[PDB]
Amino acid sequence: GSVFINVKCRGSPECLPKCKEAIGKSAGKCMNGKCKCYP
Numbered sequence: 001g002s003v004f005i006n007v008k009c010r011g012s013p014e015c016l017p018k019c020k021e022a023i024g025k026s027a028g029k030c031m032n033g034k035c036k037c038y039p
Contacts, residue, residue, distance in 0.1 A: 002028075002036035009035050 019037035
Protein backbone atom coordinates (compact mmCIF):
# COMPACT_ATOMS: atom_id res chain seq x y z
CA GLY A 1 0.00 0.00 0.00
CA SER A 2 1.02 3.61 -0.57
CA VAL A 3 1.90 6.09 2.15
CA PHE A 4 -0.96 8.59 2.32
CA ILE A 5 0.00 12.20 2.85
CA ASN A 6 -2.27 15.09 3.61
CA VAL A 7 -1.40 17.18 0.55
CA LYS A 8 -4.04 17.97 -2.02
CA CYS A 9 -3.33 17.62 -5.70
CA ARG A 10 -4.95 17.84 -9.12
CA GLY A 11 -2.45 15.66 -10.92
CA SER A 12 0.37 13.19 -10.27
CA PRO A 13 3.55 15.14 -11.25
CA GLU A 14 3.05 17.69 -8.51
CA CYS A 15 3.11 14.86 -5.97
CA LEU A 16 6.68 13.82 -6.73
CA PRO A 17 8.41 16.74 -4.94
CA LYS A 18 5.85 16.50 -2.13
CA CYS A 19 6.59 12.82 -1.73
CA LYS A 20 10.34 13.38 -1.89
CA GLU A 21 10.08 15.85 0.99
CA ALA A 22 7.59 13.72 3.01
CA ILE A 23 9.08 10.22 2.64
CA GLY A 24 12.30 10.69 0.73
CA LYS A 25 11.49 9.37 -2.79
CA SER A 26 10.10 11.09 -5.93
CA ALA A 27 7.56 8.31 -6.42
CA GLY A 28 3.87 8.93 -6.13
CA LYS A 29 0.49 9.71 -7.60
CA CYS A 30 -2.57 11.84 -7.03
CA MET A 31 -5.51 9.75 -5.91
CA ASN A 32 -8.89 11.04 -4.71
CA GLY A 33 -7.41 14.45 -4.56
CA LYS A 34 -4.44 13.77 -2.29
CA CYS A 35 -0.89 12.56 -2.88
CA LYS A 36 0.14 8.92 -2.30
CA CYS A 37 3.84 8.16 -1.97
CA TYR A 38 6.08 5.13 -2.28
CA PRO A 39 9.13 4.91 0.01
